[PDB]
Design a binder for this molecule. Structure first.
Ligand SMILES: Nc1ncnc2c1ncn2[C@@H]1O[C@@H]2COP(=O)(O)O[C@H]3[C@@H](O)[C@H](n4cnc5c(N)ncnc54)O[C@@H]3COP(=O)(O)O[C@H]2[C@H]1O
Ligand SMILES: Nc1ncnc2c1ncn2[C@@H]1O[C@@H]2COP(=O)(O)O[C@H]3[C@@H](O)[C@H](n4cnc5c(N)ncnc54)O[C@@H]3COP(=O)(O)O[C@H]2[C@H]1O
Ligand SMILES: [Ca+2]
Ligand SMILES: [Cl-]
Lengths: 141, 135
């Protein structure tokens, strides 16, 4: 894309596709979510329902806050609590056809924003890195 | 583009941090309570030694058979922290910091004496970029 086209593009053209996005499900326990976060190295990831609709975000700091006990880390709670009981549900959302400038504005306060289609099926994520890489390339010109 | 990193950075007195010698249980508590996913590690002379984050700490105790949470207070931050990190000076042009936050959520700023001065964050960059293109 040329500079005069970039600001005319859509969020979907620059999102990380869902098949490359690490995620978990509302009904998984915190142990599984902590495993996925730790093994993928991401600090927060999408939470989907069984029909692939976005319901929230789950991150390592959220999980640790739920098991940090008075005197010890209550690791047994990882198997006893589900991610939907701990996940953040007030998250921003983008549509695949949203103008890219909307996404540029939404990553000011968010490291990534989830993207969905007309039927609320999860389509991928719109990340700061992709924005910064692209804007750098074009500013430099 | 005529601006400097020091003009837009988050000043050090606003920055959450831990110190060399603190253990990982303390660092993990600070990360969890402040909500930040990675923060600087300083020494008593306020010099920057590295960055510590929640993912690093988890990976240091996540075993094949169990998560060894009970070892957190036996490991120091310097045994786990990331040390191969970019650095900026307060007088660096903003476009230099812009390039460094492509691969880093934040980049530490220090003076010519190696004293920590603040952090240059993606949010500050994105705020300014949004202003320039929206004009
Ligand atoms: N494996 C890796 N290789 C190279 N660089 C890496 C990396 N993991 C993290 N980074 C760098 O660290 C930044 C922050 O990652 P974090 O996990 O806190 O925060 C991430 C994470 O919460 C989420 N994310 C990114 N890619 C993801 C994926 N494939 N699946 C699930 N979540 C993802 O979006 C946030 C922003 O990601 P963004 O790429 O803008 O920014 C990333 C990236 O620049
Ligand atoms: N209390 C809060 N209030 C409002 N928004 C919040 C927030 N905590 C996090 N965020 C939002 O989440 C983004 C990523 O935070 P994270 O902790 O993964 O990654 C952060 C954290 O690693 C570090 N950081 C930012 N501010 C810090 C501070 N005052 N002290 C220590 N580290 C800081 O710099 C990274 C990039 O931060 P940036 O501000 O660009 O981007 C932040 C910010 O937009
Ligand atoms: Ca909201
Ligand atoms: Cl970030």
């Amino acid at each position: 894309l040329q500079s005069d086209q970039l600001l005319e593009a859509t969020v979907g053209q620059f999102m990380i596709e869902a098949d490359k996005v690490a995620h978990v499900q509302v009904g998984n326990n915190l142990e599984h979510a902590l495993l996925v976060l730790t093994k993928t190295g991401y600090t927060a990831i999408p939470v989907l329902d069984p029909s692939y609709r976005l319901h929230g975000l789950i991150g390592t700091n959220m999980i640790m806050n739920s098991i940090f006990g008075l005197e010890r880390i209550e690791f047994e709670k990882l198997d006893q609590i589900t991610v939907e009981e701990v996940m953040l549900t007030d998250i921003p959302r983008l549509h695949i056809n949203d103008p890219i400038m909307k996404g540029f504005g939404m990553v000011i306060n968010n490291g990534f924003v989830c993207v969905e289609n007309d039927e609320q099926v999860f389509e991928g994520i719109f990340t700061r890195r992709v924005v910064l890489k692209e804007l750098n390339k074009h500013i430099r010109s």
